[PDB]
């Protein structure tokens, strides 16, 4: 299971560049795909979503109608076609893997990313109450993230995700759908929260829990992140 | 002339119920073969034809009894003709598919395209629609005006299309019958032979005469004005009998015999 | 409309799964399945080698744009009823009888013959509830050894009521008709009987002709004519 | 002949067990349970219809979360459904199209199916590669797999057609325990609620209660006349009910070693194909060969309704572990969920 | 060797015959008592209200 992403680099403003992400190691033809970007000092930002079999495509409203996502099913290779590269599209582009059936864990495996340096009022906004929390190891932590609309759908699923980014590392998934641990994540993490009010409770912190924690909603499109809380030692 | 109108109202209502149940069953609650597409589109053409037969029945009954004197739009007869031509073309292509199933068995089992039924249905519906809207334009039902002199040439070529459909039906039924009665072993010969003759006789006695009298008799006889008072209601009753018998023949006795 | 984004993607995943099940069912409904039957050492392995070039054994062969599956069930030493109801809707049955085993009494319970056990097997398969329309392609095996065994010993050991001068023709025809007589209904099912040996060069054509008749009947069933 | 005196020794052992059971039973289920007021009629509507199978379905098993169910069929397809929203979660293609059973693991990570190829293969639903792959093939039987049920993510009992039930071990691959003692064609299997015992049914019309821990036939129940087709415990664990080919469904008892009631009817002449129990154990549901399931008041031997919804033979049936719904598969290739 | 098979069968019967059984009426009361005490948590006997039906 690896998602190596090619392309990227220093381009000209108003130019064009096809970013690539060649899957290898899983049944990529049965996975939905996303691109999620972050600014060099801000939080993450969702870009697009192509699904399995290329049937359903959404885009971020910032770049809708100008980007182009395209998958290749036999060669297992994912593309983002971008034209007229404006200066607000300088970011770190991540190739995110996700899959949607009952009991599934979307946004679980992320690519290594690619840098590209270039020189909506109904969107549910995620608010993180802080950006830096100083915590000694072995201490129980609670990271809060605030909504603007109740993420509890009528089916019961509360589409809130908790990610983590180690400094220098790609993002991973910790909590999917507000209460469920991902696989490979130690059981000391425990998110919980009622409607619009969410707290991720880290317990017995170690040096590997140091990073920036993101709260994404998945109730509707576009997928919107919080600012992120850089935990420090 | 009230009792042919009551008879076509009754037979049209029965055909509505039969084709509506066929449409619901085959569209939603049953599986579809590569053959049930033909039955579904025949029932759709059938439903359209008999809905327009009820409304042409009802406007006449209103102007008889209630004296409302409503006017039906002039282009409704065009879509009624399109429904009738598509229904007879479905009958012809069902016979051709049965003939190709017997004469080329390995091809029909293994190498038949899955979309061939939909392609044939779209082509036959489009061709019937094209000739019907062309007749309605050039003969005075579409866009309020038309000339009879250019109506007659295209009404004859649509009558020739009806005769071509009838001979395709007969040729395919004859080829199927001679191949079954000559070189077959394990088949129910008698019921198959009777159903082939039933389809051909129902076609000739019911569907064909209405198109012949509207498409061809109306112009060649030149004295049809006296004939229409009797010939026009019994012929459209016969075509309504075709319409009410097509779901029964091609779906109900076939699949609901158990 | 009243769905989430995730339940929307779940719905289209189920629709893709529906689509692939449809393609695989259309692929598997156009191939010919044959249930290969017979007694012990009836020559079933011989005709497997002819048409080709534990548990159930399945053989894939193709012959004139028709892809066949032939399911040998000789290794199933269990109750027949359960796994034989699992086998209805099969195109044809290839039943194997060795002609040369008319006088060979069985290796276990020496009072009993190969041929009458093959008749009992044919009666139980042919008169089955699950095979009431299935065309049985009877294969009569080892005609050569039947010739060198009927030149010396009479067929009256197995069929004492048979009255013939022990040649190639009438003895084989008597046991062929004795097998054909085992139907209760001779009007539904169609039995296709062939004579062959291991040296015999083309007897997959017999199977092809019998299944072409069955394919004609099924093509008429699929067009509403039944 | 010492075998003759051994046979008369076994015959008087039959005699001793027969009079022990006869002295054991004083009042039946129906005499002491006549005074409870009956349920009457139960109208279960077809809430869902899971379509997508093309050949006949012989197997079905519910999840322990009572939302996902698996089903097997003769088109070589094993399908996990989302029973709430009719979605197909997974569709597994099998190497052998002839499958007669399926199981869905209590944790939910595995399914196991097996049939005429004498192998109860095991498939891993939770995979980092995204696809359901086969994990272990359990090839040790010489007759067909009639049932195989999970005890745990590592242990699975497999009923087989070669008179042999077998405890397996998925991590190694080898049958740790082999259960012998039936004389023909073991057809079914049912695990105790504590999963320390299991019953099995065979074609010698005998139901044998086993022990997973040591591997011995602790009890034997003979009250049928035809081949037993499917079997199920009562939810308390102390009783079990079974169904054979003589249109008869019997409720036997572990702790009393006895038959309690016969759930036959004078009108039914086709064999039971599957049985299951409701959450309280008040209802016994039996699939049938006259195309429809019958619900039975388990304490009054009354038919409380008929789940008539299938065109062909009902082959498999099961109530969820929360007791919410009943799924019935059939040979017309349609699952129906009733509630 | 049918002597070994008959000996194994008779040792199976001689270990099965020496078990202890409860009265059948006690077992019948226990079955009826479980069915009485768990009748509230059964969504199949009574029609449960459709708000907490997950199936429509
Ligand atoms: C060419 C266009 C303009 C003609 C439109 C024809 C219209 C009126 C409709 C009426 C009923 C319709 C058919 C109804 C049933 C089906 C089955 C579906 O699986 C394939 C399409 C098909 C076969 C439809 C084709 C289009 C159809 C024939």
PDB file of C-alpha atoms in Angstrom, chain A residues 99-106 157 176-177, chain D residues 65 67-68 82 89 126:
ATOM      1  CA  UNK A  99     -13.572   3.919   0.282  1.00  0.00           C
ATOM      2  CA  UNK A 100     -17.268   4.015   1.149  1.00  0.00           C
ATOM      3  CA  UNK A 101     -19.311   1.041   2.244  1.00  0.00           C
ATOM      4  CA  UNK A 102     -20.909   0.257   5.575  1.00  0.00           C
ATOM      5  CA  UNK A 103     -18.268   0.209   8.278  1.00  0.00           C
ATOM      6  CA  UNK A 104     -15.578   1.635   6.061  1.00  0.00           C
ATOM      7  CA  UNK A 105     -12.777   3.992   7.079  1.00  0.00           C
ATOM      8  CA  UNK A 106     -12.424   6.806   4.534  1.00  0.00           C
ATOM      9  CA  UNK A 157     -23.295   8.778  11.485  1.00  0.00           C
ATOM     10  CA  UNK A 176     -13.209   8.477  11.554  1.00  0.00           C
ATOM     11  CA  UNK A 177     -16.885   9.466  11.940  1.00  0.00           C
TER      12      UNK A 177
ATOM     13  CA  UNK D  65     -24.314  -6.220  14.505  1.00  0.00           C
ATOM     14  CA  UNK D  67     -27.062  -4.993   9.842  1.00  0.00           C
ATOM     15  CA  UNK D  68     -24.799  -6.898   7.461  1.00  0.00           C
ATOM     16  CA  UNK D  82     -26.231  -3.786   3.906  1.00  0.00           C
ATOM     17  CA  UNK D  89     -21.064  -4.015   0.563  1.00  0.00           C
ATOM     18  CA  UNK D 126     -10.938  -6.361   6.410  1.00  0.00           C
TER      19      UNK D 126
END
